[PDB]
Ligand binder design. Structure first.
Ligand SMILES: *[C@@H]1O[C@H](CO)[C@@H](O[C@@H]2O[C@H](CO)[C@@H](O[C@@H]3O[C@H](CO[C@H]4O[C@H](CO)[C@@H](O)[C@H](O[C@H]5O[C@H](CO)[C@@H](O)[C@H](O)[C@@H]5O)[C@@H]4O)[C@@H](O)[C@H](O[C@H]4O[C@H](CO)[C@@H](O)[C@H](O)[C@@H]4O)[C@@H]3O)[C@H](O)[C@H]2NC(C)=O)[C@H](O)[C@H]1NC(C)=O
Ligand code: NAG
Ligand code: NAG
Ligand code: NAG
Ligand code: NAG
Ligand code: NAG
Ligand code: NAG
Lengths: 127, 128, 110, 127, 127
């Protein structure tokens, strides 16, 4: 099936996670007059917001990945939910709300876990 | 993570039919099946059937297929992820063998192998 | 019905019990899932363990499950005083229903 | 030899394929007055067209690659030409014309072949 | 310790090299009125300079890397300094001055060493 842009918004986190490229395509293209400056401001805004998400993927060792596995172990303080009660029960919309507070913390952990990982790889290849 | 209140103890006599309600809250009604299960005097517990408020689909045991009227309304949305629903249940050829406590149960998950499993239950209704 | 449990078993505080749940090849076990329910007398039940060994949310790690080619087992490690009730098992698949069992009353008198 | 920007435009597909970085460098740098708004419009246009090519490489698992090998098998309906009659006979200009129609189809195949590849890798590392 | 943006500017090249993500975060976000056009010109300038550094990392096989190891052997004409007298003696500021002349040469060597590396990998997978 082909649900469309945000088609799986109401589907479960597991279902939507197979339709990632759907939302990844339309993030950069889409699904001195008044309109002239109004459009230019939007064309620059789209690029800035895109490169910010790409910037975070880059410093997490996830550049080029849609599904990216990391080294940060899941702190149960963030959410003490079982695996089967998340990917087959919740929607990404609900999940983003429940992890609203802890999102900024995870973003830092994913960063130093990458600068230490490549610092280690620089030593693994020092022989 | 919500309540599933039911009707009162309506005691009739054999031959008639009884309609038991099940009004939901605190959760998206159309996202989970509504199971119907009874524990009568003479046997133990017996699973009657569930119905899918979203797809409208119904699956019930052959021991109750020609007796049970299983219908659902349509949820009245409260918030983005909350609604209020209602599930109905009737029985045709009622006797004294069918005397017991009846419950409705919300399904367990939205996918997987335990989708319809009676997880969140009501309170019970005493029949004839 | 056809899913015969363990009749009745007794226990003691601090100890662990074990309820059986077996039946013919038509309702057990390798080709079906096994769920366990704590059922007070004619009241509100409680899902304890679904899909053979997976526990429901909020269930204490005391309860554990196991399914063999012939029988399914429900253990109750470290008996606490609030455990006296009847325990029922159910055999099901993804697109089916619950084939409940005959029941097993558990006593903790100690 | 150093042919220059588009130097191998008339050379064979194999020859030009060794001079990829040549064309890759000058894709982003180059080889309220009237000119002021005329130049700003061009500086934004260059970035948008660049990130679109990078966006496609990203969702094909080719981010960072110049020569990228995939999993989509070559449908002979697209071109029933032999390997030696392409890389040593044709020029990339001719090739882009002969594959004009089927180009949009290949671009979709290269996308889901990557979202299924990483979905599979998420399972290979689930143990 | 957390020194901050450019905190290790006066520290040794080895110390600063562990604090790369610090400077990598604030390179794209930060640490028709007069101000309106003055700000738009800056928002475009920040993206162009960012993608230029990313463009170089891409054609060096370093896209996504903070510490990236290459194949170009260190020519002692560039700097005949010992390893221990660089990473534990000098600051990146001093180093950028001493390698000012030879920087453009290294940037070319890192490019063809990548187009030949992937051309070789295309042959390693031709069987
Ligand atoms: C929107 O939200 C609703 C509600 O949350 C979602 O509906 C739920 O979808 C999931 C997955 O799509 C369903 O779970 C599956 O259930 C099937 C059981 O169905 C089988 O049995 C039925 C009764 O016999 C029968 O009706 C089915 O037949 C088809 O035809 C009906 C016609 O009415 C059609 O409506 C059905 O959808 C069926 O297609 C069918 O025979 C079960 O088999 C599934 O398990 C399999 O697959 C899982 C992997 O997904 C696997 O792990 C299992 O081991 C097994 O292999 C699965 O559990 C759920 O029942 C739906 N209803 C609820 C939860 O109330 C809907 O999907 C959402 N859509 C979007 C776009 O977000
Ligand atoms: C979880 O987070 C808290 C602070 O948010 C921290 O103190 C604790 O060590 C973390 N636990 C694990 C296991 O990471
Ligand atoms: C985040 O913090 C706010 C503080 O007002 C709190 O109300 C909220 O519950 C927190 N989020 C979660 C998921 O607990
Ligand atoms: C080639 O493409 C056609 C449609 O364009 C498709 O039907 C056919 O299956 C494809 N063949 C192969 C081998 O991919
Ligand atoms: C593409 O389609 C057009 C339709 O007008 C056709 O003329 C052309 O030959 C097609 N391209 C190829 C390579 O066959
Ligand atoms: C060092 O560079 C010079 C020119 O700058 C070159 O002639 C010489 O071959 C190089 N030596 C090595 C070892 O790369
Ligand atoms: C670079 O060239 C200039 C030429 O004026 C020279 O003075 C300078 O010393 C050179 N740099 C180094 C590090 O030698």
């Amino acid at each position: 099936v082909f649900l469309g842009f945000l088609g799986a918004a109401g589907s479960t986190m597991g279902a939507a996670s197979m339709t990632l490229t759907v939302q990844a395509r339309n993030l950069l293209s889409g699904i001195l007059t008044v309109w002239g400056i109004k459009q230019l401001q939007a064309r620059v805004l789209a690029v800035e917001r895109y490169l910010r998400d790409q910037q975070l993927l880059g410093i997490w060792g996830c550049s080029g990945k849609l599904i990216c596995c990391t080294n940060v172990p899941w702190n149960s303080s963030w959410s003490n939910r079982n695996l089967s009660e998340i990917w087959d029960n919740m929607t990404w919309l609900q999940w983003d709300k429940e992890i609203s507070n802890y999102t900024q913390i995870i973003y830092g952990l994913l960063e130093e876990s990458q600068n230490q990982q490549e610092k280690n790889e620089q030593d693994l290849l020092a022989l | 993570q919500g309540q599933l209140v039911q009707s009162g103890a309506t005691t009739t006599k054999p031959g008639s039919s009884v309609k038991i309600s099940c009004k939901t809250s605190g959760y998206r009604f159309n996202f989970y099946h509504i199971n119907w299960i009874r524990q009568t005097a003479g046997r133990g517990p017996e699973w009657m059937g569930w119905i899918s408020p979203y797809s409208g689909d119904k699956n019930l045991a052959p021991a109750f297929q020609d007796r049970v009227n299983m219908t659902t309304d349509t949820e009245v949305p409260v918030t983005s992820f909350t609604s209020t629903g209602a599930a109905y249940m009737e029985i045709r050829n009622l006797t004294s063998d069918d005397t017991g406590t009846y419950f409705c149960a919300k399904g367990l998950l939205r996918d997987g192998s335990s989708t319809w499993l009676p997880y969140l239950w009501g309170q019970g209704t005493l029949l004839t | 019905s056809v899913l015969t449990q363990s009749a009745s078993v007794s226990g003691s505080l601090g100890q662990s019990v074990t309820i059986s749940c077996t039946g013919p090849n038509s309702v057990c076990c390798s080709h079906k899932s096994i769920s366990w329910y704590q059922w007070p007398p004619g009241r509100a039940p409680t899902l304890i363990i679904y899909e053979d060994n997976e526990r429901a949310p909020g269930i204490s790690p005391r309860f554990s499950g196991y399914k063999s080619y012939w029988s399914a087992y429900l253990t109750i490690s470290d008996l606490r005083p609030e455990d006296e009730t009847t325990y029922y098992c159910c055999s099901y698949t993804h697109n089916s229903g619950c084939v409940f069992g005959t029941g097993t009353k558990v006593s903790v008198l100690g």
